[PDB]
Amino acid sequence: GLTAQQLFNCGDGLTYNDFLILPGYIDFTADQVDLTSALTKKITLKTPLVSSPMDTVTEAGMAIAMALTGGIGFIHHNCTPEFQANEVRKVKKYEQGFITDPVVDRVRFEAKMGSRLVIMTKREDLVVAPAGITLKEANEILQRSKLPIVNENDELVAIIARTDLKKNRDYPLASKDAKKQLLCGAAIGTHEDDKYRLDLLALAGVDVVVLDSSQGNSIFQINMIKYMKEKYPNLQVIGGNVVTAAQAKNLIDAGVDALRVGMGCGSICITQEVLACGRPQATAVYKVSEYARRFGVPVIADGGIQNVGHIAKALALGASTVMMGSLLAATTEAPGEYFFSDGIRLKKYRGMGSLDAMIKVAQGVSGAVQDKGSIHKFVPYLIAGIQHSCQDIGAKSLTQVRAMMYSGELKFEKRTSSAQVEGGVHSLHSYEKRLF
Amino acid sequence: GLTAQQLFNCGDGLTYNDFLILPGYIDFTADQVDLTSALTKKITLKTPLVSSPMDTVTEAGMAIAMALTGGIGFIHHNCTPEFQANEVRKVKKYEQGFITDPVVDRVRFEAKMGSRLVIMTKREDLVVAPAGITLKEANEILQRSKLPIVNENDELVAIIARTDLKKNRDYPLASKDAKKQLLCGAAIGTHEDDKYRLDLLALAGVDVVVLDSSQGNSIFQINMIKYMKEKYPNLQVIGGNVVTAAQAKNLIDAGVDALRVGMGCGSICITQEVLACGRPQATAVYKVSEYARRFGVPVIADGGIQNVGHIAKALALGASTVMMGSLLAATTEAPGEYFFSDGIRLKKYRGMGSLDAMIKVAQGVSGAVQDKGSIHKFVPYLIAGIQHSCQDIGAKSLTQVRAMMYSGELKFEKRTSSAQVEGGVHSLHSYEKRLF
Amino acid sequence: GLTAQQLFNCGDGLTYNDFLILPGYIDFTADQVDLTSALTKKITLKTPLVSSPMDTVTEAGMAIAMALTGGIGFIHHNCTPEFQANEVRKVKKYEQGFITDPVVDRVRFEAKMGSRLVIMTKREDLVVAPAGITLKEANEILQRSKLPIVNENDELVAIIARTDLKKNRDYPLASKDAKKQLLCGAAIGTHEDDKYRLDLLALAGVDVVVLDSSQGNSIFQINMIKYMKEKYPNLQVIGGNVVTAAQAKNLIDAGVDALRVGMGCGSICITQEVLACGRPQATAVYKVSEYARRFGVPVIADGGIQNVGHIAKALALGASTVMMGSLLAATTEAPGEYFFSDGIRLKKYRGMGSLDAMIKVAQGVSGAVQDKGSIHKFVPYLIAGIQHSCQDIGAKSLTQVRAMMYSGELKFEKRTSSAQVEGGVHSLHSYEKRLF
Amino acid sequence: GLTAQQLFNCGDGLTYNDFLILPGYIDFTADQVDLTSALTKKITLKTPLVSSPMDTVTEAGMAIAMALTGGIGFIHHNCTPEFQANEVRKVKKYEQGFITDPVVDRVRFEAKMGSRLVIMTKREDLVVAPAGITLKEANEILQRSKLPIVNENDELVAIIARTDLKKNRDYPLASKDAKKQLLCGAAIGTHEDDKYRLDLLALAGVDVVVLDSSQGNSIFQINMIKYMKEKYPNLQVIGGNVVTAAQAKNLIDAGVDALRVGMGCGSICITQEVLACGRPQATAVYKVSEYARRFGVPVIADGGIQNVGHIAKALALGASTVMMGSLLAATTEAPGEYFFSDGIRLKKYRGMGSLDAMIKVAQGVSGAVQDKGSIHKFVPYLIAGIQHSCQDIGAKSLTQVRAMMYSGELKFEKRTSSAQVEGGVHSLHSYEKRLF
Ligand SMILES: *c1nc2c(ncn2[C@@H]2O[C@H](COP(=O)(O)O)[C@@H](O)[C@H]2O)c(=O)[nH]1
Ligand SMILES: *c1nc2c(ncn2[C@@H]2O[C@H](COP(=O)(O)O)[C@@H](O)[C@H]2O)c(=O)[nH]1
Ligand SMILES: *c1nc2c(ncn2[C@@H]2O[C@H](COP(=O)(O)O)[C@@H](O)[C@H]2O)c(=O)[nH]1
Ligand SMILES: *c1nc2c(ncn2[C@@H]2O[C@H](COP(=O)(O)O)[C@@H](O)[C@H]2O)c(=O)[nH]1
Ligand SMILES: COc1c(C)c2c(c(O)c1C/C=C(\C)CCC(=O)O)C(=O)OC2
Ligand SMILES: COc1c(C)c2c(c(O)c1C/C=C(\C)CCC(=O)O)C(=O)OC2
Ligand SMILES: COc1c(C)c2c(c(O)c1C/C=C(\C)CCC(=O)O)C(=O)OC2
Ligand SMILES: COc1c(C)c2c(c(O)c1C/C=C(\C)CCC(=O)O)C(=O)OC2
Ligand SMILES: [K+]
Ligand SMILES: [K+]
Ligand SMILES: [K+]
Ligand SMILES: [K+]
């Protein structure tokens, strides 16, 4: 029975595996737990999940799947500005609803004022829908397949493809923007070159942009932040990797809408070994979030997430969202082809600081992870997992979990190594592990 | 030389392997140590041993063997109410003594008032025994095989099968109820459905019932407790898994006769890894027992028992009884068939939260343990083991061990990892381990 | 720079591998270091080495070799009183000097008053030596082979075999008694039966006797101690295994001449795992020696010695001598035959609490260790090793090492696990280890 | 956020792997970081790198390569004084510039006053250079191959081989002495014999000499130091291995120009295990440097360097330079021939206290390390690695890093074992590691 303030303010250099959250009182069911989380000062998702901007994790496929399930994805920038922007465009155009370009096809089969060819099938035998209706109305109005929206003068003002109404109805947690499109985020560097790439990403319709760096507390990123906030006042920007409040302050002052917290704890990271710099994750998350919260800036616990327990712990310590690399790297929607080794299906996963991904000092390693299946199955599982944890701890929502932790109400307890060994599977001659 | 109060009140998150009990003064022999322990507020066994309510551990066979040796068993509820109740009935009818149903056979060979056929062999050549005698008397009275008990009017009032007098004489530590039957306990859930199952278990003659849950401090279990205490005033109820005094208080207030303490420390448990919730065992046991004792509520140290040292430590820290899963899972009396792998005989052992035992979030794993032989050999061994420990520590009884620990008299000392390595087998090129 | 008092009085439960001794000032050579140590209140050896009383370690061969090199041995009692006593007799008669029985052969070749046949070779052609001379004189007096000692009346008063003068001259560190015989010690239990065995051991000429027990603070051993001190006033007795000052006090009060300190840290020990009782060695040694010293009672650091560093640390913490089991178990002089496994020569080593060595609760395990060669090579090596350690720490003698440690002058420092890893061999692709 | 003073003054016995340096503010690039470091009170290198004086590490080849890249090398003394001195001579004569001996060839092709034959090619057709010019001038003056330097009377005063001007221009970081020669250092013992060897090393032109010992705080080394400072007033001397301020003081008082800090932490070291003496490196480095700095004496962090992180940490804690053995032992320039095992190329690496390198008490082990390539590639890599670390921590130079650490500005944080596990590569099914 120790509070977070007490636990993380003794200088022990703790991490996720070094502690536990003590159970509380249950008076609701796991399915009643709400995971709504703030991605940035203005982006809010239904789940606190985010896919990392890496070669072997996030591209269109992942970004789309992740958005459809309740989270969001960040496309990597280890490609051409053109390619990256196309990946953003694919994601952005995956779901639209009221398509305008192809409806105003252009007018200026169907015979809808102006000269809207979609012509032959005259505007009398065809079903139409008034302007001002909503997607719900739109769906029923033509319960079949193929809906031309008409503006007073009976002029084609828009159209809505049945397929979009399907995707919309199929994914109730979909992270969509004001235009009913799957929101997407992208990662860029801080060199001048990144200004051009940013412009192409802007044109692509990217919603949030993260400045990629192992140590984001620099004059380069600060000025880059200020630039972006100037050129694109509304664009949501996330600050480079930080692990201390002093670093966060500079980026917060520069104008960040959120912070990416984590240094050298990612599965493929050797920065701590090579550069001696970094910080134990659990502590990094608590300290920066505790600070950043006084400025309304969401913290993204980035790195070291090996399972659901970690996710719940990051959130419990102050993080608004959690970013994963390896916990998603082997899913169907991640970049790369599957292969086999010792009868084990694998997909490549490599650190962005690896010589391959990149005198060059390698800060990442290149490996492979075992097949995790589809994001469409895995993410729902993580969502269920997180919910149960909130239940045991007695919290109906992630927002509540933090209040309980900050009020002192939520208690923790350190785990000795024997205690960590006891917490996992032990004393078995053999066993298999499954979760969903 | 550190007291329990000092040791477990520093927030280190200790477990069984993290400490030792310092030896005292010996002025008696190991065989003089008494292990009588309170299972619940009213159930008291000769030993502090209990078999866990799990698919691969407890069914009739185990429950019977465990009772015969001095402990008790809890039948799992991962079966039909009918099946479970039949398992309780088998155990309950294993030993009876004065059988009534078949003696009042019905009257209304032998020719005993009324019309008691057991007829031919007239009541004159046959040996009979008066009503009011005891089992001891009964045994001698017909020193052979096949004893009709007669009520004044020479009317068949009961019978006693020689076989029961045998089982009774063979097992001096047998956990029997007021009717000379092997007591049995069963595990149920907390859903409404469990009320029906409970009723069938009541009819079966179950003696103690444990409410099965990974986090028993809930409104569901509290109300279930209150229900049971109402409907079955005398039934002994044990509260769902708890690890803190605050949780215990709710269940104690709800009316529990004992508490099942343990969360995520069981050999097949992944709850700590998946849900981030739980608590290091040694500490869980000391803290809750220290509290629950002020209300006369026995604590069951449930989980993490890998050997005799653990059992003795749980007891020394405040537990009245100890529940095991893996330490019994491979015995002859446990559910399942034996098989072989690398020339090693094994029997399945799986967590009740495993996908097999059961979106579903797995909290347990499915494995196999190596053959441990019969409960009838293993339990006596654990009993001997525990006794020696009490001797080294200078305690003639489990009751004494707790007094010494609560008075400060009993001392402990933390074990560094090197100290733990030194405590076990080391520096050998090869070795085999045996214990009994 | 931490003193022993500070280091071992924080309740951390440390052991040998958990700390280091910081180097001092060197103004002498390793060969100038003196290891003279008190075995008991009256037995003093040239080295602080002792072989453990175990089936696979100490018998005549070991006891003799160990004495010849500067230490001593304790014969095991897992044999008949006759056998054990014969093992003591073999050791005792290995070296004698002035043999009396065969010289007083009996008188009452050579023609020496009385009728000393050793006859033919008359007392005139034969060289003789006066009574009152010493062994040194004796050696030169007949610089060849085959010396009849003559008493005034020219009567055979004794004889001295050339072979004894050889053994005496060959081993300058030999642990011999007042009669120039290799001293020997033996281990006995505390049951009444041990009184008879003790008597046979007395007749055998045993010099020191250790009462064998895993927990020697008992009324059984206390009374046994008092008995022995009564019956054999001069016999040196060592107290059963203790690890705390409170235990030591009882045995010290009972009249022990030394204490055997150690519980569950021996390579083949499972007492800590099975009985939950014991104590981390380094701490056990410091605490009891710190106490026992106030009564002039030598402490024997028994158990957990895996190498020279451990020996030096035990001594530095207060032990007067060190007892080993595995560090000697595979030498030529130890009981048992050598065999081979994976091309590796081995000799059996088993705990005295193993089922084989012995319901029975096993407290020891049965294994094998790799061939260490002869005690006559290994012990000199340990002696050299210990000497260098004393040099680095700036102590010319074991006696000095303790003064420095008790005065505060000697400093220590805890070793984190990484620090322990760094202290040993690391970062090699492959390597072989040798020491002498 | 803990200062070095706080971190290393709690008695925890920390080492490199036990802590991290928290990142600061970046306002410069990695390539702008300066690694200029003081080898001794008067020797200053461009990099803080030094090759250890060992059989399998440093000989001419290594010493030359190491100097050319920015560091320095110390030739081992496990050879004849003649051999060692020849190794110094090879290194010293590798690069010269203004060669005098062969130019004053002797005078007393070319026809340059006196009788300088280099004769035929008369002094009129040949290009010459005035005395007083510099190497830069010299290079251009004869932009081709084959430059006779002439003194007023047109007398051959010196010569400069084109090859030297090449080596000079190729290696901008070259550690050269006042005579434009690659500086070299050598290791000697402290016995009288070492005085002769020293004399031969003096004649060889050695620049710095390190007194080789595992425990240099001795009367032998102190007097040896005083001797050398007397006989060779200008010679730079480094004090034997020390790990505490008390030891450093004696050697500092004796007159050391630098200190070699480290005891039993070297990859091939078993001194801690065998002699129980030594100290955890990170702590050894901070404590002695913190002291030695008050006397302007540079500390050489010697031992335990397994990678770049360690190097940066040693420097951050107070060391002026870092000495490596295994981190260089398998390079092309190190002594020994390459061989193969399991398809892995290896080169021998052995501790100088190994029986092979040397009753003898082994303090080192004999193994093999995997091929690291050329020093000419590896050292530049370490240089780049160190620079990035300085960048993350916000320091433009090693000198700055220490100021920040001593002022309190630089912060650190302990790493729990889980934190250390998280810091390295984890959660991968497989991976390969590369760095340059
Ligand atoms: C160290 N860290 C690196 C590198 N590339 C990316 N990253 C990071 O780690 C996170 C993924 O870690 P997981 O544990 O797999 O989730 C990424 O989000 C990013 O912060 C690298 O080369 N070295
Ligand atoms: C975690 N714990 C589980 C699960 N099923 C049962 N249990 C528990 O552990 C105890 C057995 O642990 P042992 O160390 O084997 O004695 C059981 O009594 C129960 O508390 C599960 O799926 N996950
Ligand atoms: C535990 N300890 C046992 C047993 N038999 C003997 N001993 C002890 O350990 C010492 C030898 O330990 P090493 O590390 O090998 O030196 C013996 O002197 C004695 O104290 C046993 O069965 N269990
Ligand atoms: C222990 N230490 C030894 C021995 N020979 C040399 N050394 C030392 O270790 C350093 C090299 O360690 P690395 O980790 O490989 O750099 C050398 O500089 C020297 O101090 C020995 O036999 N035992
Ligand atoms: C940039 O991607 C990362 C991130 C996000 C992190 C780390 C890291 O090593 C890399 C790879 C390192 C690279 C590509 C070098 C460029 C740079 O320094 O930004 C880390 O330690 O924590 C977080
Ligand atoms: C119920 O059986 C348990 C018990 C007793 C414990 C744990 C656990 O995971 C399960 C399996 C988890 C299940 C079947 C999910 C249902 C539930 O939540 O009750 C644990 O962590 O500590 C104790
Ligand atoms: C007696 O030999 C030992 C000793 C010396 C020790 C231990 C031990 O287990 C045994 C074997 C245990 C036996 C033979 C049971 C009898 C007894 O209890 O004496 C230990 O834990 O520390 C020291
Ligand atoms: C001398 O080389 C070393 C050094 C530098 C160190 C150690 C060591 O064991 C040896 C080998 C030990 C030898 C050759 C014995 C001679 C001696 O004692 O000097 C160590 O522990 O720290 C540093
Ligand atoms: K990492
Ligand atoms: K577990
Ligand atoms: K042991
Ligand atoms: K080492």
The CATH number assigned to the domain holding D64 equals 3.20.20.70
Ligand 3 pocket check for C56: Cβ under 6 Å: no
Q: Please name the residue ranges forming H helices in A156-293.
A: 162-170, 193-204, 219-231, 245-254, 271-275, 281-292
How would you classify the pairing of strands B129-130 and A366-370?
Answer: unpaired
Q: Cβ(B350)–Cβ(B365) under 8 Å?
A: yes
What whole-number distance in Å separates Cα of residue A292 and Cα of residue A284? 12
Distance B205 CA to ligand 2 centre (A): 26
Tokens of C320: 């007067």
Number of residues that this document lists for chain C:
436
> D222 CA to chain C: closest CA distance, Å?
10
Q: Please, which residues have CB less than 5 A from ligand 11, an ion?
A: C 269
Distance A68 CA to ligand 4 centre (A): 58
Residue A433's nearest CA partner among A334, A262, A301, A308 is A308
| Strands laid side by side in the C339-340 sheet | B430-432, C366-370, C345-350, C339-340
Would the CB atoms of D368 and C430 count as touching at under 8 Å?
yes
Q: D242: buried, middle or exposed (CB in 10 Å: 19+, 13-18, 0-12)? A: buried
Alpha carbons within 13 angstroms on the beta-carbon side of residue A42 total 13
Q: Considering every ligand atom, which ligand is closest to the CA of C424?
A: 12
Residue A135's CB is within 10 A of a number of other CB atoms, namely 14
Alpha carbons within 13 angstroms on the beta-carbon side of residue D49 total 32
Ligand 4 pocket check for D15: Cβ under 6 Å: no
What whole-number distance in Å separates Cα of residue C408 and Cα of residue D75? 40
Residues of C in contact with D359 (CB under 8 A): 380-381, 383-384, 436
Ligand 3 pocket check for C321: Cβ under 6 Å: no
Residue D44's CB is within 10 A of a number of other CB atoms, namely 14
What whole-number distance in Å separates Cα of residue A284 and Cα of residue A262? 7
Q: Cβ(B414)–Cβ(B19) under 8 Å?
A: yes
For residue A325, say whether it is annotated as part of any ligand binding site: yes
Q: Cβ(C386)–Cβ(C37) under 8 Å?
A: no
What whole-number distance in Å separates Cα of residue A194 and Cα of residue D288? 47
Alpha carbons within 13 angstroms on the beta-carbon side of residue A46 total 19
Would the CB atoms of D435 and A274 count as touching at under 8 Å?
yes
How would you classify the pairing of strands B98-99 and B345-350?
Answer: unpaired
Tokens of A39: 């991605």
Residue B208's nearest CA partner among B233, B184, B188, B231 is B184
Residues of D in contact with A275 (CB under 8 A): 308-309, 312, 385, 388-389, 392
| Residue written as token pair 């004893």 | B147
Interface of C with B in 260-299 (CB under 8 A): 263-265, 267-270, 272-281, 283
3-state secondary structure D326-367: CCCCCECCCCCCCEECCCCEEEEEECCCCCCCCCCCCCECEE
Would the CB atoms of B26 and C220 count as touching at under 8 Å?
yes
Q: Please name the residue ranges forming H helices in D142-270.
A: 162-170, 193-204, 219-231, 245-254
SS3 (DSSP) at D260: strand
Q: Cβ(A146)–Cβ(A93) under 8 Å?
A: no
Q: Cβ(B105)–Cβ(B118) under 8 Å?
A: yes
Tokens of C432: 């072989």
Residue C39's nearest CA partner among C291, C172, C208 is C208
Q: Please, which residues have CB less than 5 A from ligand 10, an ion?
A: B 269
Q: Which of B431, B432, B436 to mutate to test the interface with C (most CBs of C within 10 A)?
A: B431
Q: Considering every ligand atom, which ligand is closest to the CA of D220?
A: 8
Q: Which of B184, B265, B269, B390 is catalytic?
A: B269
List CB contacts of B10: < 8 A, sequence separation 6 or more. none
Q: Cβ(C268)–Cβ(C349) under 8 Å?
A: yes
**CA distance readout (Å), A423 to A17, A115, A431, C59, D385:** 10, 70, 16, 47, 38
Distance D351 CA to ligand 4 centre (A): 6
3-state secondary structure chain C: CECHHHHCCCCCCCCHHHEEECCCCECCCHHHCECCEECCCCCEECCCEEECCCCCCCCHHHHHHHHHHCCEEEECCCCCHHHHHHHHHHHHCCCCCEECCCCCCCCCCCECCCCCCCCCCECCCCCCEECCCCHHHHHHHCCCCCCEEEECCCEEEEEECHHHHHHHHHCCCCCECCCCCECCEEEECCCCHHHHHHHHHHHHCCCEEEECCCCCCEHHHHHHHHHHHHHCCCCEEEEEEECCHHHHHHHHHHCCCEEEECCCCCCCECHHHHHCECCCHHHHHHHHHHHHHHHCCCEEEECCCCCHHHHHHHHHCCCCEEEECCCCCCECCCCCCCEECCCCEEEEEECCCCCCCCCCCCCECEEEEECCECHHHHHHHHHHHHHHHHHHCCCCEHHHHHHHHHHCCCCEEECCHHHHHHHCCCCCCEEECCCC
Residues of A in contact with D309 (CB under 8 A): 272-276
Question: Neighbours of C (≥3 Cβ pairs closer than 8 A)?
Answer: B, D
Residue D265's nearest CA partner among D237, D288, D248, D284 is D284
Give the mutation target among D49, D50, D51, D52 for probing the ligand 4 site: most ligand atoms within 8 A of CB. Answer: D52
- Between the two ends of chain D, the Cα-to-Cα distance in Å is 31
Residues of C in contact with D349 (CB under 8 A): 428
State the closest ligand 2 atom to the C-alpha of B354, by its place in the atom list counted from 1.
22
Q: Which of A429, A432, A436 to mutate to test the interface with B (most CBs of B within 10 A)?
A: A429
SS3 (DSSP) at B28: coil
Continuous segment of H or E residues that includes residue B238: strand B236-242
At position B307, the amino acid (one-letter code) is: N
What whole-number distance in Å separates Cα of residue C369 and Cα of residue C346? 5
What is the experimental resolution, given in Å to one decimal place?
Answer: 2.6
Ligand 5 pocket check for A52: Cβ under 6 Å: no
Bridge partner list, A350:
A366
How would you classify the pairing of strands A366-370 and D430-432?
Answer: antiparallel
Residues of A in contact with D418 (CB under 8 A): 14-18, 420
State the closest ligand 5 atom to the C-alpha of A357, by its place in the atom list counted from 1.
14
DSSP symbols for A131-154:
TT--HHHHHHHT-S---EEEETTT
Tokens of B336: 């399942």
Tokens of C96: 């004698």
Which residues have CB under 6 Å of ligand 6?
B 212-214, 241, 262-264, 269, 271, 278, 352-353, 363-364
CA angle D83, D87, D89 (to 5 degrees): 110
Q: How many domains does chain C have?
A: 1
At position B310, the amino acid (one-letter code) is: H
Distance C347 CA to ligand 3 centre (A): 16
For residue D125, say whether it is annotated as part of any ligand binding site: no
Chain A nearest-CA residue for D26: A218
Continuous segment of H or E residues that includes residue D276: none
What experiment produced this structure? X-ray
SS3 (DSSP) at A376: helix
Q: Say whether residue B22 is in contact with chain C using an 8 A CB cutoff.
A: yes
Give the mutation target among A190, A241, A300 for probing the ligand 5 site: most ligand atoms within 8 A of CB. Answer: A241
State the closest ligand 1 atom to the C-alpha of A306, by its place in the atom list counted from 1.
14
Ligand 7 pocket check for C268: Cβ under 6 Å: no
Q: Cβ(B299)–Cβ(B292) under 8 Å?
A: yes
Ligand 3 pocket check for C325: Cβ under 6 Å: yes
Residue A276's nearest CA partner among D315, B115, C272, D169 is D315
Chain D nearest-CA residue for C23: D277
Q: Say whether residue A10 is in contact with chain B using an 8 A CB cutoff.
A: no
> D415 CA to chain C: closest CA distance, Å?
10
Q: Whose CA is nearest to atom 9 of ligand 1?
A: A266
**CA distance readout (Å), C263 to A278, C212, C276, C319, D383:** 43, 12, 11, 15, 52
**CA distance readout (Å), C285 to C15, C260, D348:** 10, 10, 41
> C190 CA to chain B: closest CA distance, Å?
13
CA A317 to chain centre: 18
Ligand 2 pocket check for B393: Cβ under 6 Å: no
Q: Say whether residue C354 is in contact with chain B using an 8 A CB cutoff.
A: yes
3-state secondary structure D47-76: CCEEECCCCCCCCHHHHHHHHHHCCEEEEC
| Residue written as token pair 């027990």 | C213
Bridge partner list, C373:
C331
List CB contacts of A424: < 8 A, sequence separation 6 or more. B270, B272, B273
Q: How many CB pairs under 8 A join C and D?
A: 186
What whole-number distance in Å separates Cα of residue C400 and Cα of residue C137? 36
What whole-number distance in Å separates Cα of residue D338 and Cα of residue D341? 10
Q: C415: buried, middle or exposed (CB in 10 Å: 19+, 13-18, 0-12)? A: buried
For residue A408, say whether it is annotated as part of any ligand binding site: no
Q: Say whether residue C359 is in contact with chain B using an 8 A CB cutoff.
A: yes
DSSP state of B408: S
Would the CB atoms of B275 and A26 count as touching at under 8 Å?
no
At position A39, the amino acid (one-letter code) is: L
State the closest ligand 7 atom to the C-alpha of C213, by its place in the atom list counted from 1.
19
Give the domain extent around A244. Answer: 1-436
List CB contacts of A371: < 8 A, sequence separation 6 or more. A330, A331, A338, A345, A346, A347
Residues of D annotated as catalytic (active site), given as ranges: 269
> Hey, CA dihedral for C204, C207, C211, C212, is it positive or negative?
negative
| Strands laid side by side in the C98-99 sheet | C98-99, C155-160, C148-151, C129-130
Q: Say whether residue D31 is in contact with chain A using an 8 A CB cutoff.
A: no
